[PDB]
Design a protein around this ligand. Sequence first.
Ligand SMILES: *[C@@H](O)[C@H](C[C@@H]1CCNC1=O)NC(=O)[C@H](CC(C)C)NC(=O)O[C@H]1CC[C@H](c2ccccc2)CC1
Ligand SMILES: *[C@@H](O)[C@H](C[C@@H]1CCNC1=O)NC(=O)[C@H](CC(C)C)NC(=O)O[C@H]1CC[C@H](c2ccccc2)CC1
Lengths: 299, 299
Amino acid sequence: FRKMAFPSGKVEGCMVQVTCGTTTLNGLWLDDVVYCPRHVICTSEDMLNPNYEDLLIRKSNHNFLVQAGNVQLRVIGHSMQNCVLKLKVDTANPKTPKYKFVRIQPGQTFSVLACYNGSPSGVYQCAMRPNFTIKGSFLNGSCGSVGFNIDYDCVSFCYMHHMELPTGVHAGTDLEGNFYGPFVDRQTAQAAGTDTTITVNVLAWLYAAVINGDRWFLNRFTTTLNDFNLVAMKYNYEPLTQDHVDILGPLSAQTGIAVLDMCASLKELLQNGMNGRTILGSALLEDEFTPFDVVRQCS
Amino acid sequence: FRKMAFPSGKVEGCMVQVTCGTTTLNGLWLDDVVYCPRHVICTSEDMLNPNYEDLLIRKSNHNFLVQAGNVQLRVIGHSMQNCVLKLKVDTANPKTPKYKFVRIQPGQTFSVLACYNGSPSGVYQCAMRPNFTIKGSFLNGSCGSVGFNIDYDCVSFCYMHHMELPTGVHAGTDLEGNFYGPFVDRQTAQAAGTDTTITVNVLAWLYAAVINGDRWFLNRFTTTLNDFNLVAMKYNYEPLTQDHVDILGPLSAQTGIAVLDMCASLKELLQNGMNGRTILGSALLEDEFTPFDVVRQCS
Ligand SMILES: *[C@@H](O)[C@H](C[C@@H]1CCNC1=O)NC(=O)[C@H](CC(C)C)NC(=O)O[C@H]1CC[C@H](c2ccccc2)CC1
Ligand SMILES: *[C@@H](O)[C@H](C[C@@H]1CCNC1=O)NC(=O)[C@H](CC(C)C)NC(=O)O[C@H]1CC[C@H](c2ccccc2)CC1
């Protein structure tokens, strides 16, 4: 059982390089539109407190250099939508997959195709935390890298990368340019607030553990939803709801472990730690697998 | 800092479905040749102790159904090379990337594109352990999935998946069909022997930690190569050599921490555990990042 990303090929064919002045980042080329973070129009002496409206007025289509491999694209229109720029180009991307834009919910997962200068470097799996940050791997130049899921042949884009926070975590927008969380695109320290653990995902991962022969943490006890949450609260775990319980149903059915029984084992793990033992090769409780992820991987 | 796979697009375009009888697995379609594990010619009542030579003699080209998406490929020749079958087909794959076959060394890493019925399901990063197993995520039907690295535009294929061991780990071949390790393709329990930790990789990962602001484990001590290895041995860590030291050089240079100083901190971690603290979000010492991987990710 491994942290698995979706195959990235459909998205690799959408990444391009966007330069304005001396600032270069990545853009997403779908049909005849390139999407990129608006701070590509910023100089280093603009990022502290940019007035994007005023900065963009000084820019014309020909100030946007868009490059797909060795080929230049002609920019024939531009506009700002929230924190993203949309550059209309004269050529539809012939590699455009079936796609949609979605605004993902906290606790859900997606794959990130980290890019630099418009070239894919690597792919990994992330979760949108309850505080609307993600714990990625991003260097200077990675802005415009996107996060996505794939449903059959359809790519659902959900994230575009914009900035780093002092805690080392990452923040960004949906593909309409609205940040996840309370963040703004300026180079100041910003607070994400307390993060909380995604309880339903930890449970899913404990089920995956049991499915993979690791069972030492199961005990003889059960609990109540109300009583588990009294312990969840203390640990900054998200409260569990009956919808969570029914979401966990197929895993409970495959393992034969009632959900409230697994909750009892989780309380004991939370109160007593792991006494140096491990679970699927981790010494911490893992919360970036959804129930859906676990089902998909164990079938 | 994250466990990152290479973009999988170049390899996605090489995966096909291979069926012989009622047994179906994945094959790798490069130029006019499809490569797949030879046990595709086995029935369930053959896998306990197959005589592959005898089994294959009963098979003709038309018994191999090769499917790429919705299109059948015509098989015009077949032969067995070690534990792989090579099916000559009448059509060169138009998506064949620049590629080579390499037999990878223990301690090195590569990406796995896990496939089922010839369709990519997910991508993740693995290491070839010192005992020539890998710790993957593979279900029935995943055989023929490949592992690879990418160097610029060139795909180096290094692994094809064949079987699972009782410990839950995985074993397979290079693309010439020679197993990594002492394994054979028959459905019996087989031993991998003691695994050992990849010391040079743990050091690389501690450097990555320091590069990412996590420094609590650094101490005031140093050691000697000879004296560190006395402690390595006891913990079933691989001995460190001066070549390892020079490999770690660029990381030592970027952080300003002498390699033997980092070795001192590692000895203390090994002797004293982590007392509930963490390093890059893990409560265990991580050994599936090479120095090269760390450099690539932190630049
Ligand atoms: C892409 O342009 C880039 C991605 C960043 C670079 C470093 N890692 C990333 O993920 N984004 C930015 O540079 C971003 C531009 C804004 C939106 C105009 N600026 C940014 O993220 O600035 C951060 C720098 C570090 C700073 C900080 C860190 C630690 C302690 C205190 C303060 C937070 C803001
Ligand atoms: C692909 O065909 C498949 C991949 C396996 C399926 C399950 N997970 C995997 O990675 N390989 C095989 O089925 C393989 C065929 C051989 C090469 C002819 N057989 C195989 O791996 O058999 C294992 C089954 C389980 C068994 C065992 C497990 C636990 C305890 C004792 C014994 C080890 C061999």
